[PDB]
Design a protein around this ligand. Sequence first.
Ligand SMILES: [Zn+2]
Lengths: 309, 288, 76, 76
Amino acid sequence: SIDEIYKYDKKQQQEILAAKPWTKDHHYFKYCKISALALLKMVMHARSGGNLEVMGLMLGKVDGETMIIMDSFALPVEGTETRVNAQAAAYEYMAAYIENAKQVGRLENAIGWYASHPGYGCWLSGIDVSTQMLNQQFQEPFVAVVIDPTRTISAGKVNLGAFRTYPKGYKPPDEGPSEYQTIPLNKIEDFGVHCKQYYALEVSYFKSSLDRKLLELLWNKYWVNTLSSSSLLTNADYTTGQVFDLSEKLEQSEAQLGRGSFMLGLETHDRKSEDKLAKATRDSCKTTIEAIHGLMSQVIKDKLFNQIN
Amino acid sequence: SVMACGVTGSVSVALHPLVILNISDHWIRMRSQEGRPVQVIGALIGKQEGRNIEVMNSFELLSHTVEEKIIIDKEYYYTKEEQFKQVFKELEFLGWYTTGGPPDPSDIHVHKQVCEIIESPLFLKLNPMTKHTDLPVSVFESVIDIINGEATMLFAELTYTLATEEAERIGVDHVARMTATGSGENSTVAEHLIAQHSAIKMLHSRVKLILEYVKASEAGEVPFNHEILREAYALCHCLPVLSTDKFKTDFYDQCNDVGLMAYLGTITKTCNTMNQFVNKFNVLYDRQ
Amino acid sequence: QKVDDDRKHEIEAAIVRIMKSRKKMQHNVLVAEVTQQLKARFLPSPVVIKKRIEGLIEREYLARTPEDRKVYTYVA
Amino acid sequence: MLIKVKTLTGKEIEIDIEPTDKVERIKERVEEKEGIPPQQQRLIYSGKQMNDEKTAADYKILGGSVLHLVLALRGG
Ligand SMILES: [Zn+2]
């Protein structure tokens, strides 16, 4: 059932919020499901911000290890945040909008915050980490989503990440692919200082009626120029960096395996090594299938156009 | 009849995907909350420059059914009007939207309550239970006609267009890509080929229209449409785009590169399967 | 009192403007980059933008370590 | 009476409140415990957002009333 996810069960949410399973595991939340509406709104806000960072709130819910997102809304930022934080008259519009949604139907409460990084990638800065750590202390089920309007245009695919922080003092396990990202020199220092204080969630969608309609319409409308070359992957950057990350991860796994071959009776090492190899394989397979799809479209369209008759 | 006959559009209406997206979400949740597809009512905001109207955003409105008529909480609408002022001042109210088929004798009641608020409101109706391949969205304006000696408000369909910024085009395009390829590589080329299939259908429809026009001109119509016919001849001259040695060499080069990448990906998948098999094989019989 | 009030408002505008840009700097790269991001230049008066970020060393949020300027606590 | 506003500190901070006092004075009391200006502070109680010029007695707030207001942060 495509529309099953849109059903809101208030008592079930209250039961989950009373249970607090995330207190039993700091890696509890692993997946982030984002609605088409949410994605579109967030991307539009980020690109209207242009080269300036904007932010908003995300409405949604939790389901097992998965955090869901549905909505998002701007807060009065008089004089581009002339006061502390991008809030000013924040919950003024927020609480009104919230009571108004309890009135017109929307009952999904705050599930997180989104912020934009125009032209400098998706990750959490020191300020972002402090903000998310605070959000993980009051509204425990919160997620820091970062978007990139400039990379959305450059690479073609929307650059989006979902993140959760670790509590002060707590160390992550050895397991950690950590995809490589191009970070400008004015941001790389802060990135490196805080990159191990949080982790990235797996961001996934679920199709839907919102998708079906939106996608079909805009697609036909603007894709009459269906060519757009055919390979926006031609830019080395993305592909090259992904392949480099894969190589690094696999070489690290090999170094581990070589040292673990001496220790007889370490099952955990074998477990993490197998998992890392498997993650590397799936990442490579997704890249390969994307390239294959691009080639398929290119070949079909080019053959149709050039020598049809 | 609430539809005006012989009345042409006086203003140009520009619609954005966000407006359609808001209507779809509003209809879905109300259907989920109250079973049957309950009709939804909202408001339209955006920028208007003279006779050019651009609907950029849209929010939902409160509706109270009393005495079998829909009463819109304009005070809630007015409460929300200053709410959207705090975030966006460039956007001005343009009209209201609803869901359903043909106009009913309840939308005229709703539209007149929107006509008293602002000078010229716009009426938009979406059909979520459509079956054709066309867009089930129509924009209607308010017109006053003398029917049987009494001034009756009617709806005149407007030939609206679709306005979209580079950012919205790219973001929704990524939305299309996220449906084409499933999260766990589900329905990989299902929506992919269907996308090119629909593009080819559009091109074939254009071709069949041109061919039908030519066949009709062969028998009747204008014997020589001048510009049109000459340009169509020159355009088929481009059907065999035709190439040289260098273009074919580059095409084969790209094909070979992508084929090598595909071979590498298949090798990676095969070696992962081999690793899993060896891990199990070290378990079932082998020790250490 | 005129020059005292004159300096009072321009230092107040100086601090307000810089915390909006709010980026880490080595010693001299952003202190000049913030001036070109204002409305009507020359109002900044660099003589105050250096001694009030040096007056910010008593606390966090760009604690601005005294000698080798590089620890600009970019966390708040 | 003392009311336990759930000011963002991980606990419900108890403050001194009189029934006749306007609810906007409650915002300043929370700022004395935290540091959020009343403009960004948004008092919320029993699921409904509290007013500004309305008095506390009009909301029937007692000494056992647990509040949950949404304040702000110290970004920049
Ligand atoms: Zn950030």
